[PDB]
Structure formats: C-alpha cells, structure tokens
Amino acid sequence: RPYQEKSLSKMFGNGRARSGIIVLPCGAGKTLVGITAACTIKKSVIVLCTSSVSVMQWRQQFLXXXXXXXXXXXXXXXXXXXXXXXXXXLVVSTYSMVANXXXXXXXXXXXXXXXXXXXWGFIILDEVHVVPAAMFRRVVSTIAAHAKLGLTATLVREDDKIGDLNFLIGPKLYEANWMELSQKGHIANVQCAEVWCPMTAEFYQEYLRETARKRMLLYIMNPTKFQACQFLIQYHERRGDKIIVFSDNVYALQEYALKMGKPFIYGSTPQQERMNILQNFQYNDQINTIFLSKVGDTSIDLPEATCLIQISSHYGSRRQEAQRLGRILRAKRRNDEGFNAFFYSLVSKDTQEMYYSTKRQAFLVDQGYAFKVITHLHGMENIPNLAYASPRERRELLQEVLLKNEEA
C-alpha cells in the first residue's frame, strides 16, 4: 500500500536512532509495516498486545514472512513459553503479564530472562491510545531499545495524556487521512446520522426528576426510540442489509434484544454461545440483526452489516464509541461501486445524552467523515407492527420503567 511506503521512507531516510508513532486504519496493513521494519533491523522484536487473537495474527504475519518454529521466534504467554536466540527474534507479549505487581505463576522469570539477558532492539506497541496508564509507564520504564515504533489507529482522548506520548515513545511521524485512503481503497463511505425522536411528557418530567446514570434508564427506554428502532430495523431488512446494534448498557441491550427477538452477546456470557451466534451471523441469512455490547466489539469486528445503530451511550466515552465505530467502518472493505455505510444515533429531544453524542459527532468531523441530521424518515407512520405506539402500551412501559427505577 502506497501510504505504507510513505511511512517506510522515514525509516529509509536516517536509518539509525528513530522513534515515532504511525497512524494507520485497522483494515490497513500496519503489521506488514512491522514485518518490513523487522526485516530492516533484524533483531529481537517484542510486540506488546492486549489479546491473544492479536498474538495469533502477528504469528500469522511471521508465517507470511519466514520461520516461526526454529529456536528464534519466541512466544510469551500465561500458557506456555518458547526459547529465543540473539541477532534475530520475533516475540509477542501481553501488557498484563509483563506489568503485574506480586502475583506470579512461575512465568515472570521467563519474561525477566528476555528483559534481563538484554535481547532487544525494536519495540512495537499495538494500540498506542491505551498507553496513557500507569502499567504502560512501568512497561516503558522496564524496557530500553535502539528503535521504537508505535502502531495505532486513533488517538482521541479527553484525559489530556495523549500529548505525553511525544516523549514517552516519540512524536507522531505520519498521520494518514482516512478520506484519501477511502479514495485509494473503498473502506465504506461513512454516513453519520442522528435520529431525533420526540420525547413523551411522563418520561420527560420523570427524566428531569432523575439524575446521574439512572436517568439513562429513562433516556433509552423511551417508546419513540422503540418505534424508530423497529422502523430502522424493518427498513434495513427491507433493503437487504444486516444490522448491528451497539449499547453501552447491558440492561438496555437485553431489553431491546428480547423485545426484538434477536441474539445478544453481553458480559458473563459463555464463549460457545458467542461463537454460535457469530457463525449464525456469518452463515445464516435469517439472522441479520445482532445486539453486541462492548465485549462483542472489542474482541472481534465483522466485515458484514452496513447498518450500525447506536442506542445506549455513556458520558465522556464518546471517543471510544467513535473508535469502535471506526473499527467497524474500516473492517468493511471490498471495493464496491456503492458501499454506503449508515450510522444512526437514536437520540431523544431535551435529554442530557444527545449533548455528548454531539461531541462524538465532533470527533467524527475531526476525522473528515460526513455528518447530517435526521429528524424522522417518512414511513414509520405506515408500520402497524410498532410497539409502544398506543397509550396503553406507553403507560405499561412507564410502569415498567418506574419499577426499574425502584429496583435501582
């Protein structure tokens, strides 16, 4: 990819003594850039990752290059260990395993052999936006190499600590514009859209009488959000496109999941059921609407479903939802003549959550994506299958929300 050689030209310029951060999309090949840099340096390279799936991907890249089984390419994890050799090495480690404090499973010595014997020379950190934390400062404080590299896709955080990475690892060298990359490769056009649904009177006065995170249980459970949600679901099913529903709250995800009758993936869920739901979403055309929480978004991103719906949201964590949204957008690439990606933000008027979703839309403006407002698409008035459209169901839902407030 041209931008990858545009990033490698900086390494080809000076050669020795360099450190910086390279911003590349998730769908791009930053791991290939790490492989090329590993071929240019030829030394013990350590790749800092947070999940085993990324370790398996880096191992697949090592297989795409050459060798992995002979005593040279090592693997560090809490399950097994593998030997290494000087002058050339490729190993992937976990942040929580290298960090620690005093808990030990007779494996911290195996890491202190890679760090004690001084077999290093190249540092690779996956997702640098997570570095602003004490454990990563300890990791950097326990390592020292000749060349450092930071592979990440985003860096927008409101912790005011992203600027420290300019001296902890190095200043950002190349930031690729996702619009020009969309022109190089169709990574699904980004259509940002907020749905403005009216707010009922009872949920408005009860919403004002509530506060903190409890008023979210009155912002999400609005009947017009159920009507507009069903209208968007039936609309996308009529267009023949799969639907992914995001929710920062597990309770709302279970409510919409059970009322819509679709599979759901949330916390404390068996992994076999998660894999079954994933296979049903990949193969079965009857399941075109999935309800995914943060566990289903951080662990895996699927290239299907051009329809992304956002209902639940948390205060301040708008940039993280923009990063996950960006992961689902960049995950969809196949060079199509159309390829229209639709992001909907179900927001209710006069609520305290839309005013942060606007900050998320500001983050979506900083990336160059297109944003437009949507009050209501004509067609919901012709859907007799809408729930909570009658005053009876609205009063019953009001009583259910009041009971939910009495439980919390």
Place this chain on the structure above:
DNA sequence: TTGTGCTATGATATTTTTATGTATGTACAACACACATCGGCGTTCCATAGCTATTATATACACAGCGTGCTA
C-alpha cells in the same frame, strides 16, 4: 453572624477482562489381600452276487404219528 456556591482533592461508585486456585468431570491403574493353582443319530433306496425249492437212485438209522390187541 450564619448560610450558600465554586476549585480542587478525597473518596465513593461502575465496568471490562487477564489469569488463578478450587471444584467438577473423567482417566488410570493399581494394591494387596482374596483367591487360585500345584505337590511331597435313524431311516431308506439301488447295484451286486449268492442262494432258495426239487428229483431221478441206492444205502442205513432215528424220530413222530397212526391203527390195532388187552384189560380193568
């Protein structure tokens, strides 16, 4: 004088996910007495070769049955 409001820290309240020690399900073999071993056939059809009854004649000998005399 006493009550009320913002900066900042202090503490208090949520959320996701790594491995870990204990629990649960499932193998394995296996220990040492409990026990074991040892000894100083019936039934039917076809080709085969022997084997059945008879006589003309002499000789001599034994065996079973019948016709006639005597007396009680």
